[PDB]
Amino acid sequence: ANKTVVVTTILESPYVMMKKNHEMLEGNERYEGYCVDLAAEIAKHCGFKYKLTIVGDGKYGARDADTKIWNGMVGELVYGKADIAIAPLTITYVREEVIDFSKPFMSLGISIMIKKGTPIESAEDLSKQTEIAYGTLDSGSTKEFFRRSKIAVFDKMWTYMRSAEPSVFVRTTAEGVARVRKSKGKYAYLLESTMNEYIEQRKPCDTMKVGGNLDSKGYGIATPKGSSLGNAVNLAVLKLSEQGLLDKLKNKWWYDKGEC
């Protein structure tokens, strides 16, 4: 018999955001954003009812090196706490080994956010100076990229970041943004081009994405490995992509009401 599908997601603008009047709203109505709209479209095409739930620990997902335990949305899927993740969850090798991913619904690359006027144009620029600190989000794919990289410039960046004091890592994108904005150009933030380009369109329009992306990947809808939901959701993603609905949702949440 049909059950309500438990969707794990994360409060990350503009994917999932609290609606203005959330304090008097319940269930899915509390939220708005790209992934809220996407969940609606996927559910419609797949014919299921669902319940959006914000991941408890507020993390994307990393495996503890000691205990081998997955946290974040990946953990929610791995341990059977959610049926599907509809979020800016990056497709990675280590994750692909433990959960299923649809074909990508959005492309991104790691990128550099600076306060306007910062004399940085590239990862190479960052790696060759010490005046401007830089870091990444915790418990996500960007941090793991640097930790695992065998590419010289990135390995050099990781060697710096891992030991920098105070810590250059942040717990949320918002914290990284604030750090860039408040540091008078002495902090640059390594984040996905999607979030970077979003922030670039928000007041007070004091940040910008600089240089090319450091890699190329995408977000996928994730399900527990072997989940029967996987096939249908994947086709739904390709259909929506082909129909141009994904391009429409991107423009809607990034650019249509940009503030800059």
Add this chain to the structure above:
Amino acid sequence: KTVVVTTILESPYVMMKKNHEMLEGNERYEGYCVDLAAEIAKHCGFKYKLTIVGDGKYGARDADTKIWNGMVGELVYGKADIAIAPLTITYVREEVIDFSKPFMSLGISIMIKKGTPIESAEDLSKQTEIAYGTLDSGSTKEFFRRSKIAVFDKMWTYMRSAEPSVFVRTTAEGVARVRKSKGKYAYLLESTMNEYIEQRKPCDTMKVGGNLDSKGYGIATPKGSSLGNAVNLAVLKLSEQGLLDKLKNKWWYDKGECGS
């Protein structure tokens, strides 16, 4: 035993090496997909035989007979174990075959003779002096055929009825037509092949406007093939090691045939 790889002669993905007539087996061929096949096979631990698709087509389903041709057909009817080629991930194909996560991104794009007065798909659709078309039996044609997006629908209505036929059998042939058409023929093809051609003599073509859509190529296996899982992880591993980027830079490497 020996994995049979179906692929297609398409520069710079798979090309006959100089003096190939005295070569044998896999050594006859060079290119991005040739190198990729080697890398995938090494990671997955299989021996393989590259074979060029008999009918020289990517893959389309005959409306009447509902039979698949091209590489898609070779997978569907058991003639090959895997396709390693610039084979576009699409909804209709995903229904009948398995695809790895993408190893390369692309979008449908416009190729014009330099100086042609066109900067967008919209421009093309709003005029009639410049003819335009696509490859036969491929994802670009099916995209326009299936599209409910206004401008693309208009372009299709024109293309389907244009006489003489605006469709071509091969990329080389569409490119020739652009060059020999004094600018009265624009070619719709994938950004990857467009950008490759853009950097080669006689440097008289160019990619204009943004891409009309966003998708990628995937390594394809028959539905439910056990090779699928390993090949998918291999793609992600190569991507994260930056080996896919290295391959792209190598085969799209600009020796400065045009300017510089």
